[PDB]
Write a protein that binds this ligand. Structure first.
Ligand SMILES: CC(C)Oc1cc(C(=O)N2CCN(C)CC2)ccc1NC(=O)c1csc(-c2cccc(C(=O)Nc3ccccc3)c2)n1
Length: 289
């Protein structure tokens, strides 16, 4: 149904959970649901939320954060709270960081692709995320369920977008490619390059891509490298990514295992994965030969 108008009086505001470019976000209770609220800061975002009300209204998917509605004083969005916080944080946050498995990596990436596929399939205007990256991917259910919100980005942006060439939903497929590499290696993409953003843009615009991964199963490598293609039209669609990923999950059982084990973690042409593919090659062997 459409989005609610909400009395700010009905909202008990607890801690701040994230101050960044987006603005500020806080935990809260509302009709005793846990919620996250974000003040809309500007006249700028206030306005584009408002042109898109019919579309935001219509989004509903398990891997997209539920938008409950908005208050009008102060103007703020009211949203599903994700106790787990960002994927970026799970991957690269402050010690102590959690252990996770290849199965988790693939699952997260599958869930991301399900949510995005849905936005691409919206009728009649396909929603394109344009900013898909681990800081906008949030986790619940002990780290096992991933949810896109917000339906230095340079390291996940497709060259045609920063290049200013008019773009499609394929830009999201590029981002997802990078995300897949990121969760598998537990490395920040293009961290070696850093400097400022334009150094990355320049590099990527020149065909530079994250390093290949030792011993990555070939089908996952093919998918990943196909998502990274310069030519958007050579990238798969998300609908296709979803079905490949869904079918690979047979070889990555245990993704429903909540994060809980600790990890002390550090980094060495090519890179080792963080996750281990041995159980995959085993289960894969049983099926084939
Ligand atoms: C990543 C950060 C910004 O947010 C969080 C951090 C933690 C966390 O790490 N904590 C620390 C303290 N610990 C004791 C517990 C774990 C938990 C929850 C959230 N956020 C949320 O639950 C949340 C839910 S939605 C959202 C968010 C963030 C940024 C932008 C937007 C947004 O603007 N979305 C949007 C825009 C237009 C239409 C629909 C959605 C939403 N954030």
């Amino acid at each position: 149904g459409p989005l609610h108008m909400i009395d700010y009086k009905e909202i008990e505001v607890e801690e701040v959970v994230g101050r960044g470019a987006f603005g500020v976000v806080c935990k809260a209770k509302w009709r005793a649901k846990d919620v996250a609220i974000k003040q809309i800061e500007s006249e700028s975002e206030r306005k584009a939320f408002i042109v898109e009300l019919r579309q935001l209204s219509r989004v509903n998917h398990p891997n997209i954060v539920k938008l409950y509605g908005a208050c009008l004083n102060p103007v703020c969005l009211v949203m599903e709270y994700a106790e787990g916080g960002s994927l970026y944080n799970v991957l690269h946050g402050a010690e102590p960081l959690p252990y996770y498995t290849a199965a988790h990596a693939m699952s997260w990436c599958l869930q991301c692709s399900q949510g995005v596929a849905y936005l691409h399939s919206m009728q009649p205007k396909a929603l394109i995320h344009r900013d898909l990256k681990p800081p906008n991917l949030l986790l619940v259910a002990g780290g096992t369920v991933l949810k896109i919100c917000d339906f230095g980005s340079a390291a996940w942006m497709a060259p045609e977008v920063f290049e200013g060439s008019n773009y499609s939903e394929k830009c999201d497929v590029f981002s997802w490619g990078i995300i897949l590499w990121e969760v598998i290696t537990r490395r920040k993409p293009f961290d070696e390059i850093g400097g400022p953003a334009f150094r990355i843009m320049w590099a990527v615009h020149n065909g530079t891509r994250p390093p290949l991964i030792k011993n990555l199963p070939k089908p996952i490598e093919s998918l990943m490298t196909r998502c990274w293609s310069k030519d958007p039209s050579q990238r798969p669609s998300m609908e296709e990514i979803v079905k490949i990923m869904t079918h690979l999950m047979r070889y990555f059982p245990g993704a429903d295992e909540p994060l809980q084990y600790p990890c002390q973690h550090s980094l060495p042409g090519r890179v080792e994965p963080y996750v281990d593919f041995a159980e995959f090659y085993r289960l894969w062997s049983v099926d084939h030969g």
